[PDB]
Design a protein that fits this description.
This is part of a larger assembly, with three copies of chain A and two copies of chain B. By secondary structure, chain A is α+β, with helices and mostly antiparallel strands. Chain A is 24% helix and 24% strand. In chain B, strands 1, 2, 3, 4 and 5 form a five-stranded antiparallel β-sheet that branches. In chain B, strands 7-6-9-10-8 form a five-stranded antiparallel β-sheet, covered by helices on one side. Classes of the chains: A alpha+beta, B alpha+beta. The structure holds a DNA duplex. It is classed as hydrolase/rna/dna.
Chain lengths: 335, 228, 228, 335, 48
DNA sequence: TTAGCTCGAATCGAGCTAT
DNA sequence: ATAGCTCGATTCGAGCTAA
């Protein structure tokens, strides 16, 4: 009857590293190899009562008493130097290949059927649309999450590191290439073919991606935020902790991977939001909602079950979504 | 001696013994299906009751952790202020109209989740009564978290009959419901021998697989699913 | 011609004929089991779907009367005065602790009956929702008044399997629920060919009886009983 | 009647060490003795539910509430430095003699018959094919389990350490020697002869195995993982822990032994699925399938019983499998 | 150490925003200037 | 209450039909 | 959707043992 496998673990393609933040001045970014790193430091914040009150704390005496005892805490803060207006963020990306092959599979017949399904996809249309959209999210600085919202000029440089050396160099204007449209461009097409060769398994590709953002002198930059155990004293609370590896502000690799993953424009709801990350049940953390609900028969699992088990191939857009979710990887199958 | 079966659990002894102090001993290991839970070296002079009492505490903490892990999510009926809880209902699933909500004064009654980011909608007492009637959770709804989703589905084309081990979650005296097999057969209007044929071990020639309607009516009458 | 069977109803023609006017004519007799409701003389040129339409209004009146005379008892939730009805729920059985009551001010919520000698019980919203969940009535609970009390009982020793005619009340194209045999079989997770053996009549070769669990689960899924 | 003995404890031949894993740059890998160790650090991860729902969680409001309350974890993560692109993994291997001799037994007659059977095996065909296959799982960096999947270039260096100094050095291109075929090669033949002399008990063999791989600049490396006690909160849950010896990320020695143990190509299914580690009952946990089922007459226990008790010698491939199980050791015998 | 625009006098940010958006009761142009300034400064508005 | 086992009888699924 | 069939396999009840 060819039921689905209980264990369907997949390994991820498109492996990014931690993205390190350094700082410097515009028009000296061609010699940015020795730019000083952005350092996460401590500052003190004093806050008032600015949250909603539950109809019992709205008493004027209680509210004023809460004012007389403000919350004192220290926060991890990352800022550019006062003589530097450009933020440099550098990471390396490795594209593996072999997306349809699971890392663990209970059923051999289901494994073979899934391999035939993915091979039929690649033979019909290869990793060309998906790689083009991944190259688009590389060209624009979407991995530069909050450091791009107010940057005046953003430039992304992507190199192909073959034997430890730049075999091919790309330079992009990350603001001309927006965060909404997946258009066509010759350099975008070349990077798309490179990522396609990586995803197909034709050759080994390693991409060094460097983004420069002209934000301003001494302006705040935004690395990834860590978890606080919340055990110390209230005055030295450490309400905000920033991610660094060796005294250098950094962005988590999975955040970079999530920003590169933002290629899903095929979800049933409208195009007002634009692309979203290719996740099962189309989850967006900021909106707190799930596009591609399982009730709407457009999530990853129902589409994969219809495509593989019972040969109901969906539309080519949903096929792109399914293959991008297999590239994304995850612990599929019933636990 | 021989293996002790307590519902889904099994206390099997080691084949070869040992001597601790001057007295003979065997290692008794506790299982939950294929999951080994604990091993104890016990004297050969213990009876089955003492061996069972040695693992009763581990079984009890497993039961407590299973009740707290798979407890049904709770909906709360609040006033316009959103502070005073007027009624609490535990539901097997949430209403499909739940969205991010803070109560206003435009509506007197609001139904909200007990989860910290609260989801809700304005509700009347008639609508709240209807939702609580058609969404409530049975008192032993936590046992469904210990069972796979392909035995608890109402879709007959996606349904699989439960195995003997999955039956013993709810049918035995050492099970999570605490009813006997004869009581379970009386609930289904079935002979006790025919129902024992359902929970027969693998070392048996006469084994029967329970049907869709019988299994789901058993779950209804046991207070596990579809009982509100 | 042929005897038209519409659920529990059966329009059988007269074996002899007559000539009212000049056209051929036959006497068609509506039956509700062993009960005769109407005799209507009709031509032979009418099709079966037109005699069905001719007898449809009497069947509709019978269904209206059956739904009205077997409506479940309605409970009313009122304030500390008894004038405003905040919520009403139809129940299959009354609460165990009802006594003759007039609401007063010492309790804010009162659960009174809809009958004019209003029995009542002081409740809070949580206990009111518990009672509503426990005691609610399914939407098609009025069909239980047309069924014997020994086929609806939950006691397995005093339970009697329904006959084919008593089964046509809840399954069939012209049944009181309106669900087909295939849909009923899909609800019970069984084949339609086996359910047709349940609904088979006058064919002594290969006719089966429904079981306790299957019958009560079917009544659960159709919305007739056990849907509190 | 010569019944089987009730204890058959065997000690493990081919005893490896924990493989310590460190980082550096390519073409300085000859002077890699002072490379800094790869350290195990912690990062915070946030994600939404991507697993299959139980059909009870398919309700849209539950999914939206789970997205609005995402699960927070801290995980141990191992990365290369942002200036290093090569990972060096080093372990020592000991090849011991006396494979057929059990460490514990109940029956002198059974152990004499077993020793005679192993001796007539070694006389008929010594440890030549088995050591040939072992040399391969060392010449290909199969002990670099997930550190080899997308590595651009992998090489391994095996040094024969005699009186604490290198007696003979081997250098192999680990990507040239595949993970599937046992071909013939002169340096591989010499290493196989050395391993055969170690297994035969005719000499002391200690090997220093060093592997270098182009994972990438700052990319993630994969040491071995530990158990999680789950005795903390659900936000700082510590869902993943990695293995370290003295602050250097490391791989468990049993994982290395399994990697070198992958020589079984004689199971009744097709060998096109690849070699398997020699085990009783041919178990693969990732695939959840048992090759060499006891229902078939090709598992280790029935082969050992037929060969020894009643002199039913199997095929030379199946007796290679039996002697490989005797080399790997194990608590055999009934109870 | 005191709070002008108490929630009791219905001139705080939250009541004005709720009335303007939900009930469509637009406040005075000064009060909506204050509300938009509160949107400019940012915040973690919105309790459970 | 657990844990089974025959033995004939009724039921079950999946093939076909007919109307 | 109604109405009914055959045929081999599975279930079912009421005896029974076994503890």
């Amino acid at each position: 009857i060819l039921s689905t496998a209980s264990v369907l673990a997949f390994e991820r393609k498109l492996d990014p590293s931690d993205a390190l933040m350094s700082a410097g001045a515009w028009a000296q970014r061609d010699a940015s190899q020795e730019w000083p790193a952005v350092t996460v430091r401590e500052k003190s914040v004093r806050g008032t009562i600015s949250n909603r009150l539950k109809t019992k704390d709205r008493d004027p005496a209680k509210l004023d008493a809460s004012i007389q005892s403000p919350n004192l805490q220290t926060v991890d803060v990352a800022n550019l130097p006062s003589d530097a207006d450009t933020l440099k963020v550098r990471f390396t990306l490795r594209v593996l290949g072999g997306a349809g092959t699971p890392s663990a599979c209970n059923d051999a017949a289901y494994r073979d059927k899934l391999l035939q399904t993915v091979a039929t996809y690649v033979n019909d249309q290869g990793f060309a649309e998906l790689a083009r959209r991944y190259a688009h999210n590389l060209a624009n600085a979407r991995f530069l999450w909050r450091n791009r919202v107010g940057a005046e000029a953003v430039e992304v440089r992507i190199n192909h590191i073959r034997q430890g050396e730049v075999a091919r160099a790309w330079r992009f204007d990350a603001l001309a290439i927006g965060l909404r449209d997946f258009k066509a461009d010759a350099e975008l097409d070349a990077l798309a073919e490179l990522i396609a060769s990586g995803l197909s398994g034709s050759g080994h590709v390693l991409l060094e991606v460097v983004a420069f953002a002209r934000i301003g002198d001494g302006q705040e930059v935004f690395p990834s935020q860590e978890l606080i155990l919340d055990k110390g004293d209230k005055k030295g609370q450490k309400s905000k902790t920033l991610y660094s590896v060796r005294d250098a502000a950094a962005i988590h690799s999975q955040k970079i991977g999530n920003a590169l993953r933002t290629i899903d424009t095929w979800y049933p709801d409208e195009d007002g939001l634009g692309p979203i990350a290719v996740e099962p049940y189309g989850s967006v953390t900021s909106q707190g909602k799930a596009y591609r609900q399982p009730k709407q028969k457009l999530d990853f699992y129902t589409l994969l079950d219809n495509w593989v088990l019972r040969d109901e191939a969906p539309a080519v857009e949903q096929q792109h979504y399914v293959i991008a979710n297999l590239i994304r990887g995850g612990v599929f199958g019933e636990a | 001696m021989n293996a002790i079966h307590i519902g889904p659990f099994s206390i099997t002894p080691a084949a070869r013994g040992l001597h601790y102090g001057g007295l003979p001993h065997h290692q008794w290991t506790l299982y939950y299906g294929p999951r080994e839970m604990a091993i104890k070296t016990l004297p050969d002079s213990y009876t089955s009751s003492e061996v069972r009492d040695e693992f009763s505490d581990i079984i009890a903490e497993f039961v407590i952790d299973a009740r707290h892990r798979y407890a049904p999510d709770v909906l709360e009926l609040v006033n316009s202020d959103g502070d005073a809880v007027l009624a609490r209902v535990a539901v097997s699933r949430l209403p499909e109209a739940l969205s991010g909500c803070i109560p206003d004064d435009r509506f007197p009654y609001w139904l909200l989740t007990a989860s910290r980011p609260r989801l809700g909608l304005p509700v009347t007492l008639n609508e709240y009564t209807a939702l609580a009637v058609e969404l409530s959770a049975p008192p032993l709804a936590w046992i469904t978290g210990l069972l796979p989703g392909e035995v608890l589905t109402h879709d007959a084309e996606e349904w699989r009959p439960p195995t003997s081990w999955e039956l013993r979650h709810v049918v035995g005296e050492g099970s999570f419901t605490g009813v006997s097999g004869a009581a379970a057969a009386a609930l289904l209007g079935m002979s006790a021998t025919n129902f024992r044929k359902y929970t027969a071990g693998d070392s048996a020639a006469n084994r029967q697989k329970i049907s869709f309607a019988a299994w789901h009516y058993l779950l209804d009458r046991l207070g596990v699913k579809r009982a509100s």
